[PDB]
Amino acid sequence: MTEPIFMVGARGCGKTTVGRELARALGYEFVDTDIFMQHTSGMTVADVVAAEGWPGFRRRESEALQAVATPNRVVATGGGMVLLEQNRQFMRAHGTVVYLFAPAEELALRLQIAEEMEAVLREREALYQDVAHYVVDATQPPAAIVCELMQTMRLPAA
Ligand SMILES: [Mg+2]
Ligand SMILES: [Mg+2]
């Protein structure tokens, strides 16, 4: 089916890259909520936070989620998208959610911090699992994740 596919996970799990390659494989559109915010508002997350705080950024992020969710589209989401319950509900309702899981060690390794990702996971691991319909090993190359997702999720290639 063509419900929107939400990619969730912590910074460093490869969301944008896997999202983009999955979208290409399925013939879907691709949008990253963080990138959408930047290029529609002109403001970075630091700008938004400096002007309106973390609460203001989280509201914008919720709004972005709602604005870009549509069928036949893969949506890569920022690390903190899973913090608000309404965001978690929105994603499981509107579509199907995939958590790109990696231990903190590997998240920290990816740097195109080890203990800061450990702490991110203590706060958010359970939230990623709560919202995810499907959990995949994000330490594989993107192409291998793409392949595994199409099989597990029973999605045809474009
Ligand atoms: Mg759904
Ligand atoms: Mg789950």
Mapping DSSP to helix (H, G, I), strand (E, B) and coil, where does residue 8 land? strand
What are the CB-based long-range contacts (under 8 Å, 24+) for 33-42? 33/61, 33/64, 33/65, 33/68, 33/75, 33/76, 33/77, 33/78, 33/81, 34/76, 34/77, 34/78, 36/64, 36/67, 36/68, 37/61, 37/64
Closest ligand to residue 132's CA: 2
7 CA to centre of ligand 2 in angstroms: 13
Measured between alpha carbons, how far is 129 from 61 in angstroms, rounded to an integer?
20
3-class SS of residue 44: coil
CA 95 to ligand 1 centroid distance, Å: 4
Residue bearing tokens 């002109």: 42
> Could you tell me the distance, in angstroms and rounded to a whole number, from the CA of residue 36 to the centre of ligand 1?
22
CA of 35 to the centre of ligand 1 (A): 24
Query: What residue numbers does the annotated binding site for ATP cover?
Result: 12-17, 140
Q: Domains (ranges, CATH) in the chain?
A: 1-158 (3.40.50.300)
Cα separation, 28 vs 22, in Å, equals 8
Show Cβ contacts of residue 51 under 8 Å, excluding neighbours closer than 6 positions: 43
> 51 exposed, middle or buried (CB, 10 Å; 0-12, 13-18, 19+)?
exposed
CA torsion, ordered 88, 94, 10, 59, to nearest 10 deg: -60
Show binding-site residues for substrate: 34, 58, 79, 124
Q: Could you tell me which residues are annotated as the binding site for Mg(2+)? A: 16, 32
Is the torsion defined by CA of 102, 81, 117, 36 positive or negative?
positive
Q: Could you give the count of Cα atoms lying within 13 Å of 142 in the half-sphere of its Cβ?
A: 15
Residue 143: Cβ within 10 Å count: 11
Residue 63: in which H helix or E strand, if any? helix 45-68
**Terminal CA-to-CA distance of the chain, rounded, Å?**
12
* Residue 122 CB neighbours (<10 A): 10
CA of 134 to the centre of ligand 2 (A): 6
Which residue in the block uniquely carries the two structure tokens 């929107």?
Answer: 4
Phi first, then psi: what are they for 40, rounded to 5°?
-100, -40
- What is the whole-number distance in angstroms between the Cα of residue 44 and the centre of ligand 2? 31
SS (H, E, C) 65-126: HHHHCCCCEEEECCCCHHHCHHHHHHHHHHCEEEEEECCHHHHHHCCCCHHHHHHHHHHHHH
Resolution, expressed in angstroms to one decimal: 1.9
Experimental approach taken: X-ray
The enclosing H or E element of 135 equals strand 134-137
